[PDB]
Structures are given as structure tokens and as C-alpha cells.
Ligand binder design. Structure first.
Ligand SMILES: Nc1ncnc2c1ncn2[C@@H]1O[C@H](COP(=O)(O)OP(=O)(O)OP(=O)(O)O)[C@@H](O)[C@H]1O
Ligand SMILES: Nc1ncnc2c1ncn2[C@@H]1O[C@H](COP(=O)(O)OP(=O)(O)O)[C@@H](O)[C@H]1O
Ligand SMILES: [Mg+2]
Lengths: 337, 17, 228, 215, 326, 215
């Protein structure tokens, strides 16, 4: 059980938190209200999006918020490759035992949430294999059998939703899909605020500019770094996408920004601050540290095309309409009057 | 339009006498 | 410290498994354990591989493999620094080389180090290794400097030492000469110039990104009437 | 796609105009004022076109000087063929628009230029100064108060938006124009006027010590 | 699947119901006539009509009706894009396996309907294999092959040749009357209703429900500023506006109903007064149209056909709400 | 492929005519009335062509002004070579059609323009006004009552279809035309007439305070 996580830690995702509250918290909080309108509670919620966008964060946050919201709830986390045994037996026995225990805890009255992380490992598909081929049938049967129980809820997360076979994703079992998009400027500011806390030491030079107003200095710094990161400067060019009918596309870093990258930027800035206090003896943090962290992160992620995802390419090709032909990694006349 | 070659994964099996 | 070496065999991108081996079951376990349901400190995983394209994007996600370090081809100053590691004052030196420096071994060693790099990175006709034709059809003459490495430096030094040993065995004069280094470097370039495909595709991608043009041809530089 | 290729052509011309200096032209009590940021002493970006018609430009020097020369040619051939008072700033602006459109569609590279044609009334006559801006494609816009060309035009255009005052004297309009341009001494400024009070040739440069006194 | 979808379940499709009856149930009463005449009843029904709506629901209804006639029922549903196994003839093997299972089911004396969905994605290719399997299953007249496709133009006419898939049936969008029908099917009389809205109808729950359904259908089928969902441009450039009446679908209406129920529950738990209000229906409509702006309309790919086939003319540019031109 | 080039040329020109302001021309008691939505004071989309022949256009200004000039050239050369009463609106329309059939198939980019040639009878003569519309392809349409060009033609055409009345006075036809055009003050309208009552030159602009009184 993972404690110490809540929706207050997650920033920039407002609609998705409300939706996950509606799908999970609301049926537990109100059951007779649902029965009055003959609205069956959603049984399955899947989370998909670019990597590192906060699927596991939302999962643990909702797991803790279900316990805190009620006026004893049990959260179960199980991974795919965990329920694989080299012997012919126990490949299916473990899953059936897990679901039987979930039903037992439901009978006890405590709501139970099962979290299937990295659903690409298992339940992906059976046709393309190039027994694992016998995992999704009994799992679907068990989910159909447990659907009648009101308090049982199944939660799944996956980076690649395409690899998952639609049979488990048909209306019924996995009826709810939630997409976690890459953060935008306001979401980036919220995420930065979630980490740039007033408890971190601040150098006297920056603090004096606000007459000791820590909150004003911190929020001004957050806005400044957000503006710096999302700016379309020539230094921010990341990729060149080529279309034969089209002239070409230009991709910046902001198109692949994520909360994990913001956290690493803050961590690198704090490391630079520690090195500064070791080398000069002046404690605190500076804006120059944040700018250097930003530029170092951009240079570090410049070479790797790792930031790109199949979802990102699908969005780009559904935006331009033309299939990509080439991707190039950008890196650094006359008589003008 | 391509051909594939298979690598098997042995499953555990044990008997007594 | 858990050191994963050659993260290409495992940690492969999910899918694209033309070979029947299934990487879609092993690498999710690594992703789940490295990230962890609960964050764990005091354990650092270091991964070294020369094929960064084949690695799955989820592994290289920041906050999971946040520290990323690229080691590049050495330049002239880096070449001198690497040579300084192998050409040490403890290595025997021929009397002729020590003669003009009046017994000061350090000056002779650093002079020889400078002389070797002066030709290794020189751009002359004899050092034209490869030629590349771009989409515009423009051609660039790449020299052995663009494909130089520390391993090449060590091989050159070892070949020079072997030539010195041969000279000692045959003629009987102890010591290592600069001409031995020149012969070693020219022989090493001749050996390595026969193979056109000796670098990873990342170098070609970097060249294409720098030039801005698509690479279509590679060539090795091995070598009707009324006339009065 | 030719249309996507045209977007590249528009970007190339826009890049050239930005890779340069800024010019402003604004109406004041005595006519129109051109103030350009120009370091050289020989190369100029402001010019007489005809008796009451002036011209400023921003971009690639050889090309907007090509246009400068073509316009001079045109204006004089008309003035001689008909009469001086028949050549108007409006005709000139229209010719530049036709020519920059033809260049933008037919030549290999589009002219990375931005033009401003200015006109004032004749001597002892009353009429508001007219400013036209011609862009690289052939588009032409009628400006009531001021034109800003080349470089980053937003901050200068806004500073002028706050500071502009109709019927400002020559010194005030010079202060406003230099101030908004900063958003530079006599050794880095090219300043000229279309003085409506002159009898015939209205264009007049303000350089050296006289410029020193005015600013 | 459970044959739980009856004729009363589907509304606005009465003519479709009768066409399906003519295509399916008629030969059963005249089997001796075909046997005497040495004939072959047609067992091919191609249901081509609107996009995501209730097109598949008609197949669930004929299965239920056929279950009623012989008074145990199997419905083999296959999706089309997921059937594709592009690599090397794997898709042909999958089609053979599906038809072998259909033959095995036909061995038992239970009617089986083999339904294929999204068949416009596909069709020297897999088409000859499909035709061969259809000819092989033709001997099993009890098995009924039912195909669905929203783009009849893209469907290869080879399957449309006389013989196997002779019967083609067109389907339509939910009409205002059909919308009132479908709204009544979910908004039943058992749902709680507001006392204030009951005051307008002296406590007649059925009349109140009918009036509320009429009101919501009229508002959703109205040309107002609240129905700016789609803006359409043309080669002629006559920019027009589509309204919530167009692109209406039953599945979306069910989602609107679900969102309205959720909003009513929220209002009950917040204000305290139980019941249903037209504000809940309007908010559900707005939210569900905001959600539905995503699924069919990324607006660069495949939307041009998705609007042109229904409207009847190719549309150069679709949107979601040089120089020297004069 | 001739078919793909024809369907590509056709959809670009049309993406230019609908990418522009709207013009209407309609018959009324005193002749023909042109009412265009035009913000500029220098750039015009309505013009005299010959004594009794007027011209309106919608599209790309430099190109339909190129056609304006060519038509003026043609009409005057004919009128001088033969006589004034020999040049007719029909000849002019035909020449524009041939020119827009040659430009569309031979030049790089089709002209994105929509033309309307209008003619009225001579002084003291009786005859119905003739309107012709020339499309960018080179087709010519004979219109009995009114022509609508550029922008969203269908909503404006629908209103004129309900409001049109033959032999409406100048004020009524102006109200109908501005109303259907809205489906704008004197500072955003270009209004001219082909007044059949004038002795020779029938074209006459209605601007300023006179336009103010009429609307
Ligand atoms: N508002 C936020 N949204 C998302 N991530 C955030 C946010 N704020 C901080 N983060 C950081 O993002 C990191 C990644 O979170 P998480 O583990 O939920 O991603 P994930 O869904 O597991 O990614 P993957 O599925 O690719 O492993 C966390 O370490 C967290 O510190
Ligand atoms: N006439 C109808 N009566 C009742 N529900 C309908 C009707 N038409 C569509 N629906 C709804 O549409 C959904 C069924 O969709 P279905 O036909 O199975 O697939 P598809 O959306 O691909 O056509 C359910 O929500 C169902 O209630
Ligand atoms: Mg995760």
C-alpha cells in the first residue's frame, strides 16, 4: 500500500481528476442515488497517454482518495509479468485466487480496486505472437462474473493503447477510457508550482527583489521559466518533419514536454544550487540555475528521438493529414539594411 | 509480406518414477 | 550500482519483434521494477549501449533514466590527452630522439605526441577516407578524423611498440622512434580504410542533420581521336 | 503542393525583413517624418521620389534600392509625359504593389522588402498626409498616422500607439519616433522630412548639427 | 449474445424491420415452395447506413425474432479492422477458422448469425478466400451472413454480384420522431421527476415524461446559436453551419442520457431536492457534444468522406467551431 | 493528367473568389447599379469601360485590375478604329471570356477573379440592361436581373431573389442591394451607376454626401 499521495500533488490535470472521481468515487459515495435512475456504475477505467504523463500518479492518488473520502478500503496492485510462472500450473490459478480474494473483500463490504499496470505485457492480443495466448479469455470471464458486484472496480494503465486488443476494451468491461495529454503552459506552471515550494532555500539576491515576499518571488520565477521553456526560440527547435506534398513541419520541445521533464529540470537546478553553495559558500537558489537546467535538459534530450511516441505521430499525421516521410534532428546572402 | 522463424520457450514439466 | 551493458539485446522497443523472441513480457517488468510502485533510493542503474535508437522510449523517459551522457569522437586536444596516457616517460625511447632534447624525456614525449596528432588530424590527400553523395548530389570528403577513437589510438600505440620490438630484434638498437609511430598510423589507416561500414547509423544521421541533405551514396578513395 | 511551397516563400521574405533594421514614418504638423536606424553614411533607406512623394524601405539593400530606382524612373517619366502635379503618391504605391506581386510570383526569390510611400499636399494647399505600406507579396495598406517597417515591429508600433499626437511639432514627433524606435545618436540615425511648407521639392534631410539640435 | 433486443427495442426503423422480415423470415414459411421449385433462398444481407449509431442493433433484433419463431441462439460478431493480419496470409487463415466455427455451430440445431462490422476498411487479396468460404457456407441456409459498411461506394462490387449477398438494406439517422422514441426507451416513466415540473402537469408522470422528451428533442433539433458544432467550407466557399440535428446518433443519445442521469445525481446530492430537470438534459447535451467533437472529427483525415457521403457532395475544407485581394 | 490539373486549377481559383468581398449588380429603372463592399478609398472594384459599358470584379486586385486595363485598351482601340456605337458589352464580355480561357489553361496560376460586364441602351433609346458574368474558367452567363460575385454569393443571391423588383427606383434598388449584401456606411461601400439617361458617358459614381442621402 502506497500512502502519502493525493490530488493536491497532481497539478495541471483538472478534468481527468473530476472524471476519475465520477467513475470511481461517486458510485461508492452514492449507491441508492444510482439505483434510483437505473444507471449502472462503470466497471472499468483505462488510462492512456504519452509516457510519464502521470497515469501511475493518478492511480495512487485515486487509491488514497477513495480511502480518505469515505466517512478500510482495500487497494490491490498487480503487474502483468508478476502473474507468470514457468510451470504449466499456477499460470491461471494465481489470477483466479486474486479475484476470489477480491470478491471476498467485497463481501466484507470494503471496496476493492485492482490496478493492472503496463497492460502491454499481458492482455495485449493473441493474433500477433510471432499460456500467454490463454490469459485474456478467463480474465474476461472473471470480469464478467464480478461485474455484478457493486464495489469491485478495475483500473488499468498503459503507454501504448494500440497493443491492447479491443475485446477487453469493448463496451462493458473496459467502458471508460481516459487520455492524459501532454501539459500546456498553464499545466506546466501548475506542475512547476507543485515542486518549487517555498520551503526550498532561496538566494538573498532574488529574495531581496521582492522584499522577502517568498510567494511572489517563487511564482514570478515559475512564470519566467514556463515562458522560457515554451518560447519558440531558434534554440528550441527539435525536429523537422518532411511531407512530399507539403513543404515540411517544425517541431519544438514544447510538443513533447511532460511533468517528469519538469521534475528533472527542478532537480538539476537544485543540484546546480548545491554545487554553487559548495563552490562559493552562498546558500540559496537562483534563476540562472533554472535557465541552465532548462538548456541542459534540452541539449541532453536533443539527440534522442525517444521523446516521440506513436500517439504523437498519430496526432501529427491526423493534424497535417499527410504521412511522414522523414524526421530530422536539428542542431547547431547579404546587403541587408 | 515477410517470413518469420520461431524460437520455442520450454515449459516446466516434472514426474516421479 | 547495477550496470546493464549492451542494453540493445534487452530493453528493446516494444513491438517490432520480427524475430520470434518476445521482448514485450520482459521489459515491462523492468519498467515496473525500476520505477517502482513506491519510490526506492540508494539503487542506481547505469546502462551503456551504442544503439540508442533501438531502446524503448518508455525506458529513456525522464525521471527513470534522467541522467543521459553522450561520449563523442575525440578532437585534436582530446587526441593529445589520450596519447599522453599511453606514451609515458617510462616507455623506452631511442637515443636519437632523446639526443636533440639533451636527455629531457618529457619534452621529447610531448613533442612526439604533438607530431603524431599533427598528421593524424591533418586534412591532406592521403587522409581522404570516404566520400559521400547527398540528395542535392554535393559530395563531402570525410577523413579518418571523423571516425577516430581512443581504441584507434591504443591500436596505433601497440602497433608502434610491436614495430619497435621488431627493430630491436633485427637490428639490435633499443628504443622507440617517431618513424615507428608514422608507420603505425599509416598502416592502421590502410587497414581500416577497406571497410566502408565501420560506424553506427547515428553518425550518418548526425551528418544528414548537419548538412540537411539525404545520404544516397558512399565511395572509398582507394585510388577518342585527333590527338597530337 | 504549390500552396505549402508559397508558405515557405512568405517565410523566407519575412525572415529577411526581420534580419535588418527598423524604420518609422509618421505624420506631424509640417508633413511626414522618416526616422530610420542606419549606421552607414553612404547607404540610405529614405529617399525623394517626386516633388511631394517620399519613400522609405526595409529589407535587402540592393533590392529596395532597385525599387527606389524604378520608382524614380516611373515618376519622372510620368511627370514629363503629363505634368508634375499629375504624379501622385497613390499611383506610385500602386506600381510598387503590381511590381512586388509580379516579383513574388514570377522570380526565383521574393524581394525581402517592405515599402512605405508617403505623400503630402502641395504648397499653400491643405490636405492630410497619406502613408501607404506595400508588403513583399503586393499587398498595400492605407495608414492614417504612422508606418513601422522591418525588424520587430510590435514594440515600436505599440510605443507609437501610446505616444502619437496629431499636429505634433517637428521636435516632439522626432522625440516620439526615436523613443518608440528604441523599444541612438546622429551617427546611427537617418532622418528626413516631407516638409509641406516647401514651395516645390518637399523632401529634406536633417543631418549633422541641425539634427543634433532637434534631438 | 442474449437475444434481448426485440423489435420494440429499435425505433424509427420500422421499415427496416419489415425489410429484414421480408429478407429473412419469408423463405422459412415457403421452404417447401423453394424445394418444389429447386430453388436457393438468398442468405446475404448487407446493412449499409449511418456511422456509429444502431446499425448493428438491427442484427441483434433479427436474431431475437428468429429465436422467437422457433420456440438456443448464437451471434458470432467479428470486427473488420481487427481481423486484418497484414503480414502474410494470416488473415485468410483467420477467415477460414471463423467459418469452421460457424459450421460447427450450424451442426447444432440452433440458428447462428455471422455478422461482420466495419467491412469498408478492407476491399489478389483476401476477397477470393471470403467468396470461397461464403460459397462453402451457402449449403448451410440456417446460418445467416450479415455485413455492415458505412461506405457502400468503397465496397468491392464482387461481393455485390448476384448470388450470395443479394439483399442490400439501407439504414438512416435517428429522425426527430425516432429521437423521441429512443429518448423514451432510456428516459422511462420510472425515473424520478421534479415536483416543480410535475406542477405543470398536475402529477401525470407519463404526460410529463412525454412533454420533457418532446422539449429536449425540439431544442436539440433546433437552429440556434447553441448548435454551432460544425462549420463547413466548399470549393464555391459557401461557409455554412451544421446543427445538433445532423450527425445525431442513438449511442450518443444513450451517452447524453447517461450524462443527464449523472448530472441529476449530482444535483440531488448537492441541492438536496430529487427529480429531473430540463437543465440536466441541456447540460448533458452540451457536454456529450463537446466529447463527440473528438471521435469522428480530427478534421484532417477521413472526415471529408464521413461528411460528403452523408451530405452528397465533396467538401474541400472542414472546421470545428499571396495577397492583394479585394 | 488533364483531369487532375483541371480539378486542381478549378478549386484554387474558387478558393480565391470566395476569399474576397462581395459585389452585386442589378437592373433598375435608370439603368444598372453596382454596389460593392470596399473599405479602401483608393482601390476600386467598379469601373467605366466604355460610353455605356460598365465593369465589376471580385477576386485578386492586381489581376482583375489587369483585366480592367486590358478591357479599357480594347474598347478604346475599337471605338477609334470603327466608331463608339460599335463597341458593345457583348464583344467585351466575349474578349474577357477568351482571355480567362487562355489564362486558365496556359499560365502557371489561373486568375482568381469573377467578372461582370454591364451594358445599358444609348441616350433617348429603349432596351433592357444586359448583365454578363465571366467565371475564371472562361464561361460566360447571361443574367436577366442581377449578378452576385465573390465571397458567400448564395446567401446574398437568396435575399436579392426575394427583394428584386423590376423598374425599382435608384433609392429602392440601393436599399435592396445593401440589404441583400448584408446577409455598411458610406465609408465601406463603393457605389456607381450606369445611368441610361446621361447623353454619352453613362457611368457615374455615387459617393460622400449624395450617397449618404440615397441610403
Ligand atoms: N501533474 C503531474 N502530472 C503528471 N506527472 C507529474 C505531475 N507532477 C509531477 N509529476 C511527475 O511525473 C512523474 C511520472 O509519474 P507517473 O509514474 O504517474 O508516470 P507513469 O504514468 O508511470 O509513466 P509511464 O506509464 O510511462 O511509466 C512522477 O515522478 C511525478 O513526480
Ligand atoms: N433505435 C435505437 N433504439 C435504442 N437504442 C439505440 C437505437 N439506435 C442506437 N441505439 C443505441 O446505440 C448503441 C448500440 O450501437 P450498435 O448498433 O451496437 O453499434 P454501432 O454504434 O457501431 O452502430 C446502444 O447505446 C443503443 O442503445
Ligand atoms: Mg507507469
Amino acid at each position: 500500500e502506497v500512502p502519502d499521495v493525493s490530488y493536491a500533488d497532481i497539478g495541471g490535470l483538472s478534468r481527468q481528476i473530476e472524471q476519475i472521481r465520477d467513475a470511481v468515487e461517486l458510485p461508492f459515495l452514492h449507491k441508492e442515488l444510482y439505483r434510483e435512475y437505473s444507471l449502472r456504475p462503470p466497471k472499468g477505467v483505462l488510462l492512456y497517454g504519452p509516457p510519464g504523463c502521470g497515469k501511475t500518479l493518478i492511480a495512487k492518488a485515486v487509491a488514497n482518495s477513495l480511502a480518505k473520502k469515505m466517512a478500510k478500503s482495500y487497494f490491490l496492485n498487480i503487474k502483468g509479468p508478476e502473474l507468470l510462472n514457468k510451470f504449466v500450473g499456477e499460470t491461471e490459478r494465481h489470477i483466479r485466487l486474486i479475484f476470489q480474494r477480491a470478491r471476498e473483500k467485497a463481501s466484507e463490504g470494503t471496496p476493492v480496486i485492482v490496478f493492472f499496470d503496463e497492460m502491454d505485457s499481458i492482455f495485449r492480443t493473441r493474433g500477433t505472437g510471432v499460456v500467454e495466448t490463454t490469459v485474456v479469455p478467463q480474465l474476461l470471464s472473471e470480469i464478467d462474473g464480478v461485474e455484478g458486484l457493486e464495489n469491485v472496480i478495475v483500473i488499468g494503465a498503459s503507454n501504448r493503447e494500440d497493443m491492447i486488443d479491443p475485446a477487453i476494451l469493448r463496451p462493458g468491461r473496459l467502458d471508460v477510457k481516459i487520455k492524459i495529454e501532454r501539459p500546456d503552459a498553464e499545466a506546466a506552471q501548475d506542475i512547476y508550482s507543485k515542486y518549487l515550494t517555498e520551503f526550498l532555500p532561496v538566494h538573498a539576491d532574488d529574495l531581496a527583489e521582492f522584499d522577502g515576499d517568498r510567494s511572489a518571488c517563487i511564482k514570478a520565477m515559475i512564470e519566467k521559466v514556463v515562458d522560457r521553456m515554451y518560447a519558440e526560440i531558434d534554440d528550441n527547435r527539435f525536429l523537422e518533419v518532411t511531407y512530399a506534398n507539403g513543404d515540411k513541419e517544425v517541431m519544438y520541445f514544447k510538443d513533447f514536454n511532460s511533468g517528469a521533464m519538469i521534475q528533472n529540470v527542478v532537480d538539476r537546478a537544485k543540484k546546480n544550487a548545491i554545487k554553487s553553495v559548495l563552490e562559493t559558500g552562498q546558500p540559496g537558489l537562483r534563476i540562472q540555475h533554472l535557465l541552465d537546467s532548462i538548456v541542459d535538459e534540452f541539449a541532453e534530450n536533443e539527440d534522442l528521438p525517444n521523446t516521440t511516441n506513436p500517439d504523437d505521430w498519430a496526432r501529427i499525421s491526423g493534424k497535417k493529414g499527410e504521412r511522414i516521410v522523414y524526421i530530422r534532428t536539428l542542431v547547431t546572402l547579404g546587403q541587408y539594411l | 509480406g515477410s517470413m518469420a522463424q520461431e524460437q520455442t520457450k520450454r515449459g516446466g514439466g516434472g514426474g516421479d518414477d | 550500482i547495477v550496470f546493464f551493458d549492451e542494453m540493445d539485446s534487452i530493453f528493446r522497443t516494444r513491438g517490432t519483434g520480427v524475430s520470434s523472441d518476445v521482448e514485450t513480457t520482459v521489459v515491462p517488468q523492468l519498467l515496473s521494477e525500476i520505477d517502482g510502485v513506491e519510490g526506492l533510493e540508494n539503487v542506481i542503474v547505469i546502462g551503456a549501449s551504442n544503439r540508442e535508437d533501438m531502446i524503448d522510449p518508455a525506458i529513456l523517459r525522464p525521471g527513470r533514466l534522467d541522467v543521459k551522457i553522450k561520449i563523442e569522437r575525440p578532437d585534436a586536444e582530446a587526441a593529445q590527452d589520450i596519447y599522453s596516457k599511453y606514451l609515458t616517460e617510462f616507455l623506452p625511447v631511442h637515443a636519437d630522439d632523446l639526443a636533440e632534447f639533451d636527455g629531457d624525456r618529457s619534452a621529447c614525449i610531448k613533442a612526439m605526441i604533438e607530431k603524431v596528432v599533427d598528421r593524424m588530424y591533418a586534412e591532406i590527400d592521403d587522409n581522404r577516407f570516404l566520400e559521400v553523395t547527398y540528395a542535392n548530389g554535393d559530395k563531402e570528403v570525410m577523413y579518418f578524423k571523423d571516425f577516430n577513437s581512443g581504441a584507434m589510438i591504443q591500436n596505433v600505440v601497440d602497433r608502434a611498440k610491436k614495430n619497435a620490438i621488431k627493430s630491436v630484434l633485427e637490428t639490435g638498437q633499443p628504443g622507440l622512434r617517431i618513424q615507428h609511430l608514422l608507420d603505425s598510423i599509416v598502416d592502421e589507416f590502410a587497414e581500416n580504410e577497406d571497410l566502408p561500414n565501420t560506424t553506427n547509423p547515428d553518425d550518418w544521421a548526425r551528418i544528414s542533420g548537419k548538412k540537411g541533405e539525404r545520404i544516397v551514396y558512399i565511395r572509398t578513395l582507394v585510388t577518342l581521336g585527333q590527338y597530337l | 503542393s504549390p500552396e505549402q511551397a508559397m508558405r515557405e516563400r512568405s517565410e523566407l521574405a519575412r525572415k529577411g525583413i526581420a534580419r535588418a533594421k527598423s524604420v518609422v514614418a509618421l505624420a506631424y504638423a509640417g508633413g511626414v517624418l522618416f526616422v530610420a536606424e542606419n549606421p552607414s553614411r553612404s547607404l540610405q533607406k529614405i529617399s525623394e521620389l517626386y516633388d511631394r512623394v517620399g519613400f522609405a524601405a526595409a529589407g535587402k539593400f540592393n533590392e529596395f534600392d532597385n525599387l527606389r530606382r524604378g520608382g524614380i524612373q516611373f515618376a519622372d517619366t510620368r511627370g514629363y509625359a503629363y505634368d508634375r502635379r499629375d504624379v501622385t503618391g497613390r499611383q506610385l504605391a500602386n506600381v510598387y504593389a503590381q511590381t512586388l506581386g509580379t516579383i513574388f510570383t514570377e522570380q526565383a526569390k521574393p524581394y525581402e522588402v517592405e515599402l512605405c510611400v508617403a505623400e503630402v499636399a502641395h504648397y499653400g494647399e491643405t490636405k492630410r498626409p497619406e502613408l501607404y505600406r506595400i508588403t513583399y507579396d503586393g499587398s498595400i495598406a492605407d495608414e492614417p498616422h504612422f508606418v513601422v517597417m522591418g525588424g520587430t515591429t510590435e514594440p515600436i508600433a505599440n510605443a507609437l500607439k501610446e505616444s502619437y499626437a496629431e499636429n505634433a511639432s517637428l521636435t516632439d514627433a522626432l522625440r516620439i519616433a526615436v523613443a518608440a524606435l528604441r523599444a541612438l545618436g546622429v551617427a546611427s540615425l537617418e532622418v528626413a522630412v516631407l516638409d509641406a511648407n516647401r514651395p516645390r521639392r518637399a523632401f529634406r534631410r536633417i543631418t549633422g548639427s541641425a539634427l543634433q539640435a532637434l534631438l
